[PDB]
Amino acid sequence: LGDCLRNWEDLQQDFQGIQETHRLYRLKLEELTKLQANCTNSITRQKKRLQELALVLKKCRPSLSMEAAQELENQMKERQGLFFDMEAYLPKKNGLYLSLVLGNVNVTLLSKQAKFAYKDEYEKFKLYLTIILIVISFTCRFLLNSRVTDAAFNFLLVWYYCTLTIRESILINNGSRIKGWWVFAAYVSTFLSGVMLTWPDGLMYQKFRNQFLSFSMYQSFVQFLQYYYQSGCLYRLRAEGFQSWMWRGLTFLLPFLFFGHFWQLFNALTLFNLARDPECKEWQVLMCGFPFLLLFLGNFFTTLRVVHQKFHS
Amino acid sequence: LGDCLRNWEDLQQDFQGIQETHRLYRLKLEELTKLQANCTNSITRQKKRLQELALVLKKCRPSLSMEAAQELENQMKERQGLFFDMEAYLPKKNGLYLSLVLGNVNVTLLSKQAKFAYKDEYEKFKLYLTIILIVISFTCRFLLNSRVTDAAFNFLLVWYYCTLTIRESILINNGSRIKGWWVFAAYVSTFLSGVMLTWPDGLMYQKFRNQFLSFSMYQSFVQFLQYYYQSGCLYRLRAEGFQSWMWRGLTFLLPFLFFGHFWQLFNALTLFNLARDPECKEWQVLMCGFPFLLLFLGNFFTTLRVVHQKFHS
Ligand SMILES: CC(C)(COP(=O)(O)OP(=O)(O)OC[C@H]1O[C@@H](n2cnc3c(N)ncnc32)[C@H](O)[C@@H]1OP(=O)(O)O)[C@@H](O)C(=O)NCCC(=O)NCCS
Ligand SMILES: CC(C)(COP(=O)(O)OP(=O)(O)OC[C@H]1O[C@@H](n2cnc3c(N)ncnc32)[C@H](O)[C@@H]1OP(=O)(O)O)[C@@H](O)C(=O)NCCC(=O)NCCS
């Protein structure tokens, strides 16, 4: 009717406004997309030129005011670190893994509150799937001696460790100092739980079923303590007394980490004593004992490293 | 030395500049991040108010110049589509699936050349993994009658269909009109290839091994024709004569799509005749015949839908 168009025009009176407002935004979006690329080639050509200055300096300090020359070291150690806080608000480019899974989308959070809010969502993610991986691995272990439910647990374990590699790769390019092992221990665990699906139900599977299930039920319990430490370390780093918490959550975490690292060792030697048995006929016995042997030496000799660097600091 | 610092200062004569330049960028980045949210709440409150105008009109046209009332339709048919080209340069928010896998990162490409360059990379991705899924499924089918290599093919098939759901979900929020089935046919195929790993090597597996392997070797060959059509429809839509190609690549695609849809039907009825056999003892016989029965009715009655809408246009 008449008024039916009267309200139709009182709403398009400002549709000229957003149409006007959306012009001055795609213009801002396009001039901002060039300020990023401008600011990216200019701090990357200086940095590659900066290290060139260091090598020209590195060769002389052995041959040589002993520190008058290394007074230039702390001059380019913070500056190269100044470039790192610069490059933290510039869009990076995906690595070989994210370009595979996601393509060439941009995954860098261009804020300091957005890297936080994403690393908080990441710790909550590992906690919510820890409440599922400890409820599904408890029925599997105690309530149901089945194989369709045990294969549904390894399909969650595979999907949960594949989602970690993706989320730990979005953290790694948005400014996270995740040591190389922790991102590899997820590929090793996806593999170890992948060869766990191909394992035919038989006599060796029922002899390692209780060990694997009650370990990945413990490995979820220790991820409840990792959460409360990890999320307490990122909610306190945002805002001396922080090393009194860090050296308290760690003291109450290491015994539960080393009881887990020596359960992976025990889980490996088992699959090596299940192989020497004639009733064994499956390669999956040996090809699980090696991941449990990698995950031991990798996790153990890295958690010791993390404490060897925190002891000095 | 002396000149060793002379070049140290000639390189930081502009480090005051980028430090200056990087201030005026994070300021632009922060005022742009507010222009997006400003422009997002203003075209979403008008749109939800726009449909309100339509319902206030929709009730009167049956009860009632009746076309002077319905000329309001095409007045807000493209207007609501005008909002769709607006919202195409604003960052969306991830759906329930991307928020699971990726978190709350932003995955929308804010350009028209960036949505193209990402949908081109997506078609090339499906082509490169089609050359792997046709080389690994040919050895499996003809060269190697093994089980560790057949389980390595289903682990690629699972990973390939899980990477499609992620990449088809980044397309869907960056402006792609992918029909609901095509994104579901990937969850059905991941499941069907997931219950293909749990299938214990036995007597029923060796009776369906040749069918499944030679189908997923055909299904890769038809993805060579899908690529050259999909990428030909993507490089021509960028730049009458386009319906002469579209109705030619389609004419040479439908016979290869319906020979594939009636192979999924044949693959389903087989797993229903492998169940009625006493020598069958595995639920995986039935739980594959249903996905092959979904993938038939879903793919077939959707490819017919796609041709039923292109016939009218
Ligand atoms: C000591 C420990 C508990 C955490 O200490 P930490 O202070 O967080 O480690 P770092 O000082 O090296 O910091 C590395 C960065 O990556 C994170 N990080 C540390 N361990 C990580 C891990 N396993 N996975 C992902 N991120 C990790 C840290 O939060 C930090 O992030 P940020 O600097 O961007 O904020 C670590 O050894 C750990 O997490 N071990 C788990 C291994 C395990 O599960 N063993 C049992 C198997 S049954
Ligand atoms: C007809 C067909 C070949 C493609 O026609 P089409 O014109 O591309 O489809 P539409 O017109 O509906 O367009 C839908 C959108 O999603 C894309 N699309 C179409 N089919 C798609 C599919 N299976 N997967 C992903 N995207 C698809 C289109 O490229 C288009 O993208 P865009 O508009 O953002 O540029 C389609 O039926 C198809 O791809 N079928 C494949 C199913 C199959 O593999 N069967 C054999 C199984 S053995």
Numbering used by the authors:
A (entry chain B), B (entry chain A): 9 to 72, 76 to 250, 262 to 335
What does the report in the manuscript say about this coordinate set?
To determine the identity of the small molecule implied by the broken density in the tunnel of TACAN, we determined the structure of TACAN with His196 and His197 mutated to alanine at 2.8 Å resolution. Our rationale was that if the His residues are catalytically important – by analogy to ELOVL7 – then their mutation might influence the occupancy of a potential cofactor. The map showed clearer density consistent with a coenzyme A molecule (CoASH). Native mass spectrometry (nMS) was used to confirm the identity as CoASH. The purified TACANH196A H197A sample contains a mixture of the 83,237 Da, +767 Da, and +1535 Da mass species, corresponding to an apo form, one and two CoASH bound forms, respectively. After incubation with CoASH, some fraction of the apo form shifts to one and two CoASH bound forms. Additionally, the +767 Da and +1535 Da species are replaced by +795 Da and +1591 Da or +811 Da and +1622 Da species after incubation with the two CoASH analogues S-ethyl-CoA or Acetyl-CoA, corresponding to the CoASH analogue bound forms. In the purified TACANWT sample, the apo form is dominant and incubation with S-ethyl-CoA shifts it to one and two analogue bound forms. Together, these data are consistent with our cryo-EM results and indicate that TACAN is co-purified with endogenous coenzyme A. ELOVL7 showed significant activity, while neither the wild-type nor His196Ala His197Ala mutant of TACAN showed any activity.
